[PDB]
């Protein structure tokens, strides 16, 4: 009915990744503004057509969302939803983190998030603050589906075995292991969104034996650096959710009922 409501004015990029580029989007005729991901499929054909594919399966407040695409040739065009708050790693502030109701309310909505993608099956599998945006009401939001994957499909589970993620984010089960569960791997990783949130800062490099932050942290010296400057509370759930052992390790679930996650810490929105 309406001429030109099809018509999106790029107006500024919001950042160029390694595969392509994102753009803000504003339509010629609402003014509306949504995320446009562009991308040379001749710069991947397969890899790109799962990430759209998984993002027709999301629909929840805590997770990007996707409006649809555009072939176009060979550069595909996702329509996501615009996240005017950025990315929660620009939230956390170099060797300090932030307010603790703050990083509560966070990782509050990050579980929500997490919650609802297992429960149908998928896993994210790159969980950090560069994946995690905000949107005008400080809301987080779940972004790039780029990784991805099924993990549950008819009821049945599969194990995963492919090597993927960011070495600071990842489960030592991953680097030690030929197979493993997908959800206690999101688990870890979103401990680890917790302690940087908490502490401005990461823990160690990889979580590997060799490496001597991670061996510490296993040997309880939580006087150092990292460990001293969060919380005998939250500090309590960290020790629950990052446990080499995967099967040992915290589940969501039991995340819920954690003294830490359910300690009244942060009021609601200032005047609402």
């Known amino acids: 009915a309406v001429p030109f409501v099809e018509d999106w004015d790029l107006v500024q990029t919001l950042g160029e990744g390694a595969y392509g580029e994102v753009q803000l989007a504003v339509n010629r005729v609402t003014e509306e503004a ?3 991901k562009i991308v040379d499929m001749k710069r991947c054909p397969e890899n790109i057509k799962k990430e759209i ?4 399966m999301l629909n929840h407040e805590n997770v990007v969302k996707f409006y649809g695409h555009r072939r176009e040739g060979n550069i595909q065009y996702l329509f996501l939803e615009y996240c005017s708050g ?9 060797d300090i983190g932030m307010p603790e109701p703050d990083a509560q309310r966070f990782f509050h909505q990050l579980m929500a998030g997490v919650v609802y993608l297992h429960g149908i099956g ?4 790159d969980i950090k603050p560069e994946n995690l945006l ?12 780029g990784l991805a994957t099924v993990f549950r499909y008819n009821n049945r589970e ?11 984010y990842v489960a030592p089960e991953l680097l030690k292991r030929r197979e493993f569960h997908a959800e206690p791997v999101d688990v870890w990783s979103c401990g680890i969104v917790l302690t940087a949130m908490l502490a401005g800062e990461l823990p160690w490099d990889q979580p590997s034996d060799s490496c001597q932050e991670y061996s510490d942290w296993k040997e309880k010296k939580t006087y150092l650096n990292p460990w001293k ?7 309590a759930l960290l020790h ?15 995340i819920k009922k954690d003294r830490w996650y359910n300690k009244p810490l942060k009021k609601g929105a200032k005047r609402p």
Do not use: Q, W, Y
């Open 134 to 145: 905000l949107d005008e009401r400080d809301n987080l939001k779940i972004s790039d589906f």
């Open 86 to 94: 950025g990315e929660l790693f620009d939230r956390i502030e170099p």
């Open 229 to 235: 400057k969060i919380d005998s509370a939250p500090l």
């Open 122 to 125: 998928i896993t994210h599998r």
């Open 158 to 168: 599969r194990l995963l075995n492919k090597m993927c993620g960011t070495l600071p």
């Open 53 to 56: 594919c998984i993002n027709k």
């Open 240 to 254: 629950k959710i990052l446990v080499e052992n995967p099967s040992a390790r915290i589940t969501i679930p039991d």
């Open 34 to 36: 949504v995320a446009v």
